[PDB]
Amino acid sequence: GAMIESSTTIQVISAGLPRTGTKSLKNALEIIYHKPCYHMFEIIFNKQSDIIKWQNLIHDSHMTTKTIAIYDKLKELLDGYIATTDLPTCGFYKDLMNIYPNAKVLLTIRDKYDWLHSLRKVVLPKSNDPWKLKIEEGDKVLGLNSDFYKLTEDSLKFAFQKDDLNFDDDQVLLECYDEYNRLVQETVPSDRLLVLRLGDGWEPLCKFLNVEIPNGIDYPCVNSHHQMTQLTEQLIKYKSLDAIIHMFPDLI
Ligand SMILES: Nc1ncnc2c1ncn2[C@@H]1O[C@H](COP(=O)(O)O)[C@@H](OP(=O)(O)O)[C@H]1O
Ligand SMILES: O=[N+]([O-])c1cc(N[C@@H]2CCN(Cc3ccccc3)C2)ccc1CO
């Protein structure tokens, strides 16, 4: 196809929850658009100063005049990006649709038990799981503190529309996952929504976005819980990111 000059603004809003292929989708959108896509890894690795900003925005999110200040801060946080994925953004999908009326919406989904298992290995181990201590030890190497965990918790509560949440309760998390995915599909006009399942690859995505399939580039497969376990163990072993980063090429 011909090469055209794409606008550096949010063109794709992905409402998918963490551990549904968000990092592979981020990578895929960056391959298509050649500009950055937001993700929790953007915060962790490039913009830890954004943590307090997302926390403030969530704090005010329950609240039109008030909306304009909030929408202005969302636009500010996303300046220079061509798409959003992952927490903390995904709970804001309805507001992002208003701010970027010409953006299209994605929802990444998967088997709920595979999702929960992945979530418990990477994002939200149970309180009494010994792996939680290793996760926390590796995170300190990256400069992540209790405010990072607060942002994860609060952005999940915001996405699930809950005042509080028993994070150690699998049944609660599974119900919230199903309800969240059902609500996205009931909210977004079908013309504006593409549901992606793990394994779908390039073709439905590129058709929805009116772009060619990237020539000679396989659809990304990154950020498996096995890979995250290795990342945590290697951070613990070497005590820095820069000592190990060459071992995690497309994930980091
Ligand atoms: N192209 C692909 N095909 C199959 N699974 C993929 C994939 N890309 C990512 N995944 C899976 O999506 C999960 C990561 O999602 P996210 O990037 O949103 O955290 C991981 O699940 P597992 O933890 O079950 O391996 C990973 O294996
Ligand atoms: O809020 N999330 O959804 C969310 C939270 C985390 N936190 C986890 C807890 C343990 N630590 C492991 C690690 C994962 C990746 C990079 C470095 C370290 C971070 C990670 C991802 C997401 C979504 O991509």
Nearest ligand atom owner, CA of 143: 2
Nearest Cα neighbor of 44 from 86, 6, 7 is 86
Q: Given the CA of residue 110, which atom of ligand 1 is nearest to it?
A: 12
The angstrom resolution of this structure is 1.4
Give the number of C-alpha atoms closer than 13 A to the C-alpha of residue 217, restricted to the C-beta side. Answer: 16
Instruction: Give bridge partners of residue 107 from the DSSP assignment.
Output: 195
The coordinates were experimentally obtained by X-ray
Nearest Cα neighbor of 225 from 91, 93, 108, 131 is 131
Task: Specify the residue with its C-alpha closest to ligand 2, atom 7.
Answer: 123
- Distance from residue 156's CA to the centre of ligand 1 (Å): 19
- Distance from residue 23's CA to the centre of ligand 1 (Å): 8
Residue tagged 């995170």 (tokens): 139
Amino acid sitting at position 143: G
Strands 37-38, 193-197: pairing is: unpaired
- Distance from residue 28's CA to the centre of ligand 2 (Å): 19
Nearest Cα neighbor of 20 from 181, 171, 211 is 181
CATH of domain 1-252: 3.40.50.300
Sign of CA dihedral 186, 94, 58, 123: positive
Both structure tokens of 167: 């994070």
Q: How far is CA 9 from the centre of its chain?
A: 18
Nearest Cα neighbor of 155 from 58, 14, 40 is 58
Looking at the chain, after which residues does the C atom sit over 2.5 Å from the next written N, breaking the chain?
Answer: 63
